[PDB]
Amino acid sequence: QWYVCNREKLCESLQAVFVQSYLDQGTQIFLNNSIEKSGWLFIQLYHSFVSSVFSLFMSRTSINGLLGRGSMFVFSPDQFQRLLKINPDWKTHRLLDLGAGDGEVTKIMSPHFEEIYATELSETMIWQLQKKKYRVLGINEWQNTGFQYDVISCLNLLDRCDQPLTLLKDIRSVLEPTRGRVILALVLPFHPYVENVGGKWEKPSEILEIKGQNWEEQVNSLPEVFRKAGFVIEAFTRLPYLCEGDMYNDYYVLDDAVFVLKP
C-alpha cells in the first residue's frame, strides 16, 4: 500500500536502483505506540490549549518540541540498513542529519556511527537533540568545519529550506568522496514551504524544478536536480513518513521518496 511503486512509470535507469521496503516490526511498534498515545484525550486537550495560546508567538514545530508531541518515523533499522546496503555490524565515523527534528530518525541511524552531528532551527527541538547527547551544529557551521562527513542525511529538509540547491552543493562540499553517501528524503508531490509563526507557510527563495503529477513522475524528475550539485542516485525506496496522532486521527502518514546518493 505505502511501499509500492509502478516501476514502469520509471525510466529504465531508476528501475534498477530501486529498493523495496515493507512493514517492519519497528514500523509495527511505532504505529502501536502512536495509537496508544493518541488515545489519551485529556492530555491532548492540555496540548491543544497550550498550542492555541502559544501559536500566537511560536512555530508549530517549536510548540510540538516544547510538549514532546509529534515524533515521526521514516525507516526502521531493517529498512535503513538494507537501503544503505550496509551490515548490522557496520560502523563508520561521522554522520550529519540536517534538520534532525526531535532526533528519532537520527536515533534510528545512530548505532552505525561513532560521531553523530546535527543541525536544527527550532531551539525547543535542539534541546531534545542535546538531551540525546548530539553535537548541535549551526546552519552555517556544518559546511565550514574542517571535517569530511562519511554519511550526510538531509531527510525531509528540502521542502522546508530557503536554498535547497545551495544546500546540496554544500553537502557535496563536506562529504567524503570515496565512500561517502547522502541519505535524502522528499515528500512527493513536492510541497516546498518555509515555516513561520502559528503554522503559516512562506515560499522558498530557491524552488526545485521537480515537475510531475504523481510520485513516479517527480522521482523521474529528481536526477537533474541531484546532478547539478554533484550527486547520482545509487539506490532509493518508497516509504511512509509517519507521525504520531492527535485527537481526530490516531496516526498520520505522508508519501516519502528516500534516495541514497553517490558523489
Binding site: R160, V187, C243, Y252
Partner: peptide
C-alpha cells in the same frame, strides 16, 4: 496534525 506540515 502532522509535524512536517
Amino acid at each position: 496534525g502532522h509535524t512536517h506540515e
